[PDB]
Design a protein around this ligand. Structure first.
Ligand SMILES: [Mg+2]
Ligand SMILES: [Mg+2]
Ligand SMILES: [Mg+2]
Ligand SMILES: [Mg+2]
Ligand SMILES: [Mg+2]
Ligand SMILES: [Mg+2]
Ligand SMILES: [Mg+2]
Ligand SMILES: [Mg+2]
Ligand SMILES: [Mg+2]
Ligand SMILES: [Mg+2]
Ligand SMILES: [Mg+2]
Ligand SMILES: [Mg+2]
Ligand SMILES: [Mg+2]
Lengths: 95, 76, 95, 45, 137, 234, 243
RNA sequence: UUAAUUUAUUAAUGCAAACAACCUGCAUUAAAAAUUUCGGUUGGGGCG
RNA sequence: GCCUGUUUACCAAAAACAUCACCUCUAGCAUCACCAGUAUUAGAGGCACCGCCUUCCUUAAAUAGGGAUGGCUCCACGAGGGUUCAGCUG
RNA sequence: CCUCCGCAUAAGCCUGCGUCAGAUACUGACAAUUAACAGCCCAAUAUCUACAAUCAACCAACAAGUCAUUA
RNA sequence: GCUACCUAAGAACAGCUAAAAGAGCACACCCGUCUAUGUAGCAAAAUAGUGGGAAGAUUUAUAGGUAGAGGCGACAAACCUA
RNA sequence: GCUAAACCUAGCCCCAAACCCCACCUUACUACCAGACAACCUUAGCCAAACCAUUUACCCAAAUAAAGUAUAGGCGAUA
């Protein structure tokens, strides 16, 4: 996402009022484009054995592309939500 | 090389509203309004049949359904 | 300047005057000497001493500055340790 | 030589300044609306 | 991309016809290795300062030679008075020596037939021109 | 603008089709190509450029009879009405195509090169190297698109693997799968080059409008080191 | 003359008059209430006060949102509150240079999403922000059910929300029929978002759609006066006989 | 127009983004244009 | 100026514009122009058909007129600009 | 004595030298243009249709063209 | 609805000479070389004579199209309702 | 003494209060046939800056005051 910032500061509007913008307040500068940020990783809990990542019920940091394109769509993994983590914890302690 | 340019070919119908893709809900269309409005979903009208025989608005059956139709092709 | 603002109908202050001149409540305007920070290496000590001084303005200059500034700048200010507190008033002045 | 720029023809008149053409586009609809607001007896040609 | 930008420099920024560019590639493959900017400088040296038109630049493999040699010999002749850049009308007081007579010929032949000077003077001029180029850069 | 292309017919036919001139105008009504307009009214004859088009419920190589060779107003080359089985179609006649001649259209890539008789269609793989060809396809079954003007003839320069190198009339090499079909010989009306228009009226008949009267005078922008020598005064 | 009411209150007055008045109260409240969408194209200030470096004094600060343009194509997709920024820039980022119009557009991807509640796969033009939001919500269903109307900012998204909410409210057996255990598991997973069907029916409906729905609900062919008068006369005769 | 300021717009490429292409963001190069100006004295003109 | 044509509607009809012919540049290709075309094609432009090689005279007096790759070349034509025999005429 | 014209159709206009009664081809009232001419058309689905016109026959062509049906 | 160009489907071009002609003479028709009238005119570009073309790159009725940071232009910077 | 001259109300302005049979999208005002195209998208510029190129007040949801103050600004016109 493109993040922009006004060149010209907007005068304070008040508490209940809305700011009044003018032509110069429509001038922006790009502070950051999120798409150029360094890639992060997605936490997933595997449900089936998958090569070179894990076997089952182990938290894994996978590239977002892999997580969203293969694992989650094919059901090989599930989101590392608190509920899923708890359920796989009961699975492990029962095994 | 196919004959008949795209621009002259009959225009493809517009894509169906996404509302029709949701199983559980009945879309709100302008069918009840009895006229088009651009902010309501487009109705899917059932096929219409006149109900009687009007000679000046006759639609003949497909060629395969005619009584005299024959697989063997005569040459007249 | 702006004699009647479009939002309040008030007379506006030329802030270029405020950024450059001091008004003593007696009605005098004080200023720095132009070029007092320029090319001091080629100026004699007497010239530098003359330039480093705070200087009063003409009658016509003071009238122009009074017109260009609003009444808020022509009030009594009882600042804590103002160096110009003594200069804010005239003494032993005949006509 | 000049002056007779008008060569009347009802087909052109109706096809160029008719009610149907004025309603055919939003700009023509606003033209009709302006005439109605002004109170023109003749909204279209 | 390298090949395409070389061709685009030869076509859009040097105004060589398509056939001219093909012939240039055929006759002077080293142009492909030669970096951009340097090639444009060489071409404009031939075009403006030397007054050589595209047909001649292509017929004589001018782009084959190096910019150092080109500048050395050409500036030597220009300062000697042998060469002269064409005027606005494209005319010169004395006909200019042929590009083959300048670049293709060996150093000795260039100095004798065309420049008619001494190798010692040519070496001195080469050193001086190298120093001038270094100072300019 | 309310412009709809006249190229709306969907079924191939032999009848000349009434074609509407464009005048160089887009569908928007604005001139897009200049120098086009007017000229003699013409009727379009749908040319079948896929010469190997076996009839319905039929397959394999087939022969045809050249019913006639005719002048085509819409092309430099002349056309030939040719009939096979129970159908007729227009094709681009070759240099020596005559009425009553026989034409062969085959898709068979024989192990040996097929005797190249002018006017017949064989896959490029079936032709001897160096044979003159025309109505060449870009892809198998695409339909002839290259070497279609009067008197033009490409050369089957090379054949290696399933790829044939053809020399287009512009003397450019082109690679095409050897399964794509082409017709032997040079296109008809070979003397189209020598035609002399004679007068401006003939061009106007052909539909070409006069060039603009404006006098049209890019340039090499000199680099800063060279700006001092651009316009040396006399 | 002067209008009795400010022109900007005319929409509210129209809502308080007519069939819009007959519209259900919860839907009217949902329309009336407006909440600022989550910042997407600008970085909000951390606090309400800030020590300005110039004079070193505490000053109030406000988060003035950047106007966003949402082309109609967005309403057919799921953009995570993202849209076109139609603004202006200073060439070379210096105010003493030229001012140029600038449109920043989001990078749109085509992706397939599976809805557990709807048991359907949708192909949706989506943004990387939307994908990140879905990951944070732990699924498309959770994202749709959690994200409010303003943040979702998609007619298709709101239609999906309405479908999911109606499915949950009805506990529809059409979800994985012949697998009641799986259906119950899904409903339990998304239990917290369940709401009464009478309210779920109106979720995400535009004003025009709600008006049409109300008209369809309350449209009734007039009862013949014969029936009314027969009932009245029979009742009157009953009273006469009894008394 | 080799006056100043721009590339908003198109065409290319490069790097990101995303999985070769398309799209988006950021750059570079051109084409096309856009806004604006064209000080003073020296009868005019050229060079001054 | 090759020619027929075109042009400043309302002060310029021309030597200007176009023009066959020739020359230069660009393009290897399908479903809305070019084009339902394909290098003998299409577009952009230059130039202008074709064809070739490489002091005297007029008057009596005549600042008028005529003769001793481009360049040359006037066959035909012109409400084009000049000159002229003879005739004609307020 | 003139005749460039004129009579019709088209297009345009819309009662704009018909009668009566008044004002000074104007006003008010009354009347009138009658369809055969012309406009206003076509039940579907496929399928058909290479061979100009020019007295259409010789002849000549080029700029290659307005004229059609079947189940 | 003028005009520039274009699209669809139409129409006109006597007579003579030549012969299949962007040919010659010359009606209608289109144009507008020169003179005269006129100049608040019959006319916001006309009239009379004279003249160019007049089977073509001709003229022309009908309907449609291209719209102003544009159109159209056999470039005159011409024309796009005086 | 001719042309004429004279008029007073038709109405309007500013506020307050108060919220406001038939035909007709085809050639509109046309009784009567197979649909499908449907909408959203920064105002700009004049002008001021004594040119002009960044910039140049404008239905804003309580009058007053804070205040033309803090701030912004070729730190300048001005905001
Ligand atoms: Mg306040
Ligand atoms: Mg007309
Ligand atoms: Mg001429
Ligand atoms: Mg002529
Ligand atoms: Mg013209
Ligand atoms: Mg004129
Ligand atoms: Mg004239
Ligand atoms: Mg004389
Ligand atoms: Mg005749
Ligand atoms: Mg003639
Ligand atoms: Mg000119
Ligand atoms: Mg001029
Ligand atoms: Mg100014």
């Amino acid at each position: 996402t493109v993040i922009v910032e006004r060149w010209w500061k907007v005068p304070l509007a008040g508490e209940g009022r809305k700011p009044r913008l003018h032509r110069r307040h429509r001038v922006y500068k790009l502070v950051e484009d999120t798409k150029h940020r360094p890639k992060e990783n997605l936490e997933l809990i595997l449900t089936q054995s998958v090569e070179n990542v894990g076997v089952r019920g182990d938290l894994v940091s996978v590239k977002k592309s892999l997580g969203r394109n293969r694992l989650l769509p094919q059901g090989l993994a599930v989101y590392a939500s608190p509920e899923n983590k708890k359920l796989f914890e009961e699975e492990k302690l029962l095994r | 090389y196919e004959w008949g340019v795209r621009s002259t070919r009959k225009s493809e119908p517009p894509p169906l509203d996404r509302v029709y893709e949701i199983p559980g809900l009945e879309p709100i269309t302008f069918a009840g309004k009895m006229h088009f409005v651009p902010w309501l979903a487009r109705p899917i009208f059932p096929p219409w049949d006149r109900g009687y025989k009007d000679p000046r608005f006759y639609r003949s059956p497909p060629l395969h359904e005619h009584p005299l139709y024959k697989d063997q092709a005569c040459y007249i | 300047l702006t004699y009647f603002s479009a939002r309040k109908g008030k007379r506006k202050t030329v802030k270029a005057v405020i950024d450059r001149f001091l008004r003593l409540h007696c009605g005098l305007w004080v200023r720095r000497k132009a070029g007092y920070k320029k090319k001091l290496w080629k100026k004699t000590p007497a010239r530098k001493k003359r330039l480093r001084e705070f200087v009063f303005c003409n009658k016509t200059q003071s009238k122009l500055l009074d017109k260009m500034t609003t009444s808020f700048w022509k009030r009594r200010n009882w600042y804590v340790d103002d160096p110009y507190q003594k200069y804010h008033d005239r003494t032993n002045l005949k006509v | 030589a000049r002056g007779n720029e008008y060569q009347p023809s009802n087909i052109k008149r109706k096809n160029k300044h008719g009610w149907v053409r004025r309603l055919s586009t939003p700009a023509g609809v606003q033209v009709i609306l302006r005439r109605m607001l002004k109170g023109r007896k003749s909204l279209s040609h | 991309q390298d090949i395409n930008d070389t061709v685009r420099l030869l076509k859009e920024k040097c105004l060589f016809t398509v056939q001219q560019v093909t012939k240039i590639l055929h006759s002077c493959p080293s142009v492909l290795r030669e970096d951009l900017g340097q090639l444009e400088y060489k071409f404009q040296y031939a075009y403006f300062r030397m007054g050589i038109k595209h047909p001649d630049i292509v017929k004589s493999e001018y782009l084959q030679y190096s910019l150092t040699k080109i500048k050395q010999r050409h500036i030597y002749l220009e300062r000697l008075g042998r060469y002269q850049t064409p005027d606005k009308k494209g005319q010169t007081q004395i006909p200019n020596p042929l590009l083959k007579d300048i670049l293709r010929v060996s150093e000795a032949e260039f100095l004798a037939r065309t420049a008619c000077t001494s190798v010692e003077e040519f070496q001195v001029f080469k050193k001086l021109l190298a120093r001038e180029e270094e100072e300019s850069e | 603008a309310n412009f709809v292309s006249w190229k709306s017919r969907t079924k191939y036919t032999i009848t000349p089709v009434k074609m509407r001139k464009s005048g160089g105008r887009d569908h928007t009504g604005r001139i897009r190509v200049h120098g086009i307009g007017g000229g003699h009214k013409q009727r379009y004859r749908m040319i079948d450029f896929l010469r190997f088009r076996p009839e319905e419920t039929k397959s394999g190589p087939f022969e045809e009879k050249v019913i006639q060779v005719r002048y085509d107003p819409c092309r430099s080359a002349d056309i030939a009405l040719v009939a096979g089985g129970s159908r007729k179609r227009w094709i681009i006649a070759t240099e020596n195509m005559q009425a009553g001649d026989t034409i062969l259209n085959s898709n068979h890539i024989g192990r040996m090169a097929v005797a190249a008789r002018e006017g017949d269609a064989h896959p490029l793989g079936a032709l001897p190297v160096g044979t003159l060809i025309n109505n060449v396809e870009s892809e198998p079954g695409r339909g002839a698109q290259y070497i279609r003007a009067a008197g033009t003839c490409g050369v089957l320069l090379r054949k290696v693997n399933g790829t044939a190198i053809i020399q287009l009339p512009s003397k450019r090499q082109m690679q095409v799968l050897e399964t794509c079909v082409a017709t032997v010989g040079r296109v008809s009306n070979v003397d189209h080059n020598k035609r002399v228009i004679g007068k401006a009226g003939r061009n106007r008949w052909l539909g070409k409008r006069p060039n603009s009267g404006r006098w049209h005078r890019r340039k090499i922008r000199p680099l800063p080191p060279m700006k001092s020598y651009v316009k040396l005064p006399s | 003359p002067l209008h009795k009411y400010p022109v900007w209150l005319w929409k509210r007055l129209q809502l308080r008059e007519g069939i819009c008045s007959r519209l259900p109260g919860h839907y009217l409240r949902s329309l009336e209430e407006e909440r600022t969408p989550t910042p997407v194209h600008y970085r909000p200030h951390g606090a309400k006060f800030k020590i300005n470096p110039k004079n070193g004094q505490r000053e109030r600060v406000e988060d003035v949102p950047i106007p966003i343009y949402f082309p109609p194509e967005s309403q057919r997709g799921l953009w995570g509150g993202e849209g076109w920024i139609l603004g202006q820039i200073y060439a070379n980022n210096d105010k003493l240079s030229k001012r140029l119009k600038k449109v920043w557009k989001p990078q749109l991807f085509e992706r397939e999403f599976y809805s557990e509640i709807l048991d359907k796969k949708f192909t949706v033009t989506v943004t990387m922000r939307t994908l990140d939001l879905i990951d944070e919500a732990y699924g498309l269903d959770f994202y749709i059910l959690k994200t409010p109307k303003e943040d979702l900012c998609s007619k298709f998204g709101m239609d999906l929300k309405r479908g999911m909410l109606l499915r949950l409210a009805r506990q529809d057996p059409q979800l994985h029929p012949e697998d009641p255990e799986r259906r119950a598991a899904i409903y339990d997973k998304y239990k917290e978002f369940a709401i009464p069907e009478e309210e779920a029916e109106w979720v995400g409906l535009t004003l025009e759609e709600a008006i049409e729905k109300q008209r369809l609900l309350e449209e009734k062919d007039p009862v013949p006066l014969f029936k009314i008068y027969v009932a009245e006369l029979i009742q009157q005769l009953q009273q006469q006989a009894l008394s």
